[PDB]
Design a protein around this ligand. Structure first.
Ligand code: Q5W
Length: 138
């Protein structure tokens, strides 16, 4: 029974650098971030409403655990602790609204969707800007 469960590898990444600009990241780091983003792998274990997600590059890995509908702490795309909450939008799309623990900055959110043709699509939004990363089953 195919759901979000599996090992995914990035095949495209539109607007990553623009998003990091909105998050105040300096040019050079933006450019390295982009280079490193072509090696993004994602591992998802899913049972019902409940998700384990590991995202790794060449040199960094992180894990989140969440239940749909339950608040949890994570990091934004610019690595600040935030409050996060995930809701379904349809059978195989979910959206996440984030609010900052401490401090001021852009409105962030993200979405994961499992298309009919077997891709995983990730959007990440900072204010006006929308990054789109497409993944395929490893
Ligand atoms: C599930 C997930 C994956 C993902 C992909 C790319 C990311 C880039 C950065 C940066 C900088 C942070 C987190 C990423 C996470 C996700 O939910 O991301 C928000």
């Amino acid at each position: 029974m195919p759901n979000f469960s599996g090992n995914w590898k990035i095949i495209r990444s539109e607007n990553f650098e623009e998003l990091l600009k909105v998050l105040g990241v300096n040019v050079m780091l933006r450019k390295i971030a982009v280079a490193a983003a072509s090696k993004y792998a994602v591992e998802i274990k899913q049972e019902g409403d409940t998700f384990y997600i590991k995202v790794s590059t060449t040199v960094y890995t992180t894990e989140i655990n969440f239940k749909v509908g339950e608040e949890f702490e994570e990091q934004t795309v610019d690595g600040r602790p935030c409050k996060s909450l995930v809701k379904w939008e349809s059978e195989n799309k979910m959206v996440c609204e984030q609010k900052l623990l401490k401090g001021e900055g852009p409105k962030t959110s993200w979405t994961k969707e499992l298309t009919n043709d077997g891709e995983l699509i990730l959007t990440m939004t900072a204010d006006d800007v929308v990054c789109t990363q497409v993944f395929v089953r490893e």
